[PDB]
Design a protein around this ligand. Structure first.
Ligand SMILES: CC(C)(CNC(=O)c1ccc(Oc2ccccc2)cc1)c1ccc2c(N)nc(N)nc2n1
Ligand SMILES: NC(=O)c1ccc[n+]([C@@H]2O[C@H](COP(=O)(O)O)[C@@H](O)[C@H]2O)c1
Length: 313
């Protein structure tokens, strides 16, 4: 019953179908099929892999549960630095930022506005569509290679929609509910609770046992293209849409603003919706939308001159 030949073909069918369902469930936050449909196919795949372990692949959904236990993390260089952001705290700071931008560019400019997610910055590298390296930001030029841990974060694709080679960046965070649940479990086990979601996500990704990480319910929001590869985006808003197109999870609250006044309205809007979000945010990030204009503004030693983070008090 069921030969290696038949199982080999069936395994790929299952991985493709299950991965599509996972993409819808974890990346789109909108499943198409009921859980039992996914569970049935998943069990079939588990049976095939148990019978023929050689059919297990890096992109099989069964690998999300982890298993490897590292002795420590290897250094993860960032040839393209992961910059920090300059901060603003008042309406004055924001309009001041706009003034400097207009002074340098010589004309009004559009701004892509995004929410600043309270989590840990991460870099994801793909070669021919295959996930090959996951890394923390560290000090900006050198972080930690946490590839194995990130393989367990359900929203991180193991194989992209297109076999392209790129490096993208974003935030890995822990949703409020999972943060609450985790602290309750720690209280039950006599452990020190995490002070906030940020520390919980950072501590989770520092865990050497991938099995533990797999149960931490971490999620992601990607917003930066570091190595474009064949990507076509020419603006940040376009980049966000393209990141979504190739398979990554992006934050849906993004908005392209045609004026600094629209920018401030965005800030006021989400400062109010803040408590309603399933994840914590420490602010709003405002970026000159056009890459050509970002290039003109350049970077300071620490951050780009074309973006600013409005921090909530
Ligand atoms: C804007 C940027 C600083 C990312 N960008 C970069 O790090 C970056 C780095 C080299 C770049 O270009 C170079 C490429 C090669 C060599 C030198 C520069 C361009 C952007 C940033 C930082 C933190 C963010 C955050 N917490 N939330 C959101 N929503 N957005 C954020 N955006
Ligand atoms: N309906 C779907 O498309 C879908 C996809 C992935 C996981 N799930 C559910 O998520 C839970 C965890 O499953 P995984 O650990 O395999 O990701 C299960 O309860 C499963 O049914 C549902």
């Amino acid at each position: 019953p069921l030969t290696l030949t038949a199982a080999t073909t069936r395994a790929q069918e299952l991985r493709k179908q299950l991965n599509q369902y996972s993409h819808e469930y974890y990346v789109k936050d909108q499943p198409s099929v009921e859980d039992y449909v996914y569970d049935r196919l998943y069990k079939e795949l588990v049976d095939i892999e148990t019978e023929f372990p050689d059919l297990i692949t890096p992109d099989s959904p069964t690998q999300r549960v982890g298993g490897k236990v590292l002795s420590g993390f290897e250094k993860a260089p960032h040839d393209i630095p992961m910059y920090s952001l300059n901060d603003g705290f008042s309406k004055e700071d924001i309009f001041a930022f706009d003034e400097r931008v207009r002074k340098a560019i010589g004309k009004p400019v559009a701004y892509c506005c995004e929410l600043k997610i309270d989590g840990l910055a991460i870099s994801l590298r793909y070669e021919n569509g295959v996930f090959v390296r996951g890394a923390t930001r560290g000090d900006g030029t050198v972080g930690e290679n946490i590839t194995e841990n990130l393989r367990t974060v359900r929203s991180v694709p193991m194989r992209l929609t297109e076999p392209i080679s790129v490096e993208v960046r974003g935030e890995c965070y822990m949703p409020k509910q999972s943060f609450v649940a985790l602290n309750e479990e720690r209280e039950e086990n006599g452990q020190d609770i995490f002070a906030n979601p940020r520390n919980a996500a950072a501590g989770s990704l520092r865990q050497l046992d991938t099995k533990i990480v797999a149960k931490r319910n971490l999620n992601t929001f990607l917003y930066t293209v570091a190595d474009f590869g064949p990507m076509k985006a020419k603006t940040q808003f376009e980049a966000l849409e393209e990141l979504s197109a190739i398979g990554f999870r992006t934050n849906p609250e993004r908005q392209l603003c045609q004026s600094i006044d629209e920018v401030w309205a965005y800030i006021e809007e989400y400062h109010e919706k803040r408590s309603t979000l399933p994840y914590e945010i420490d602010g709003i990030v405002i970026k000159v939308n056009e890459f050509a204009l970002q290039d003109e503004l350049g970077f300071t030693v620490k951050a780009p001159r074309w973006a600013i983070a409005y921090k909530f008090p």
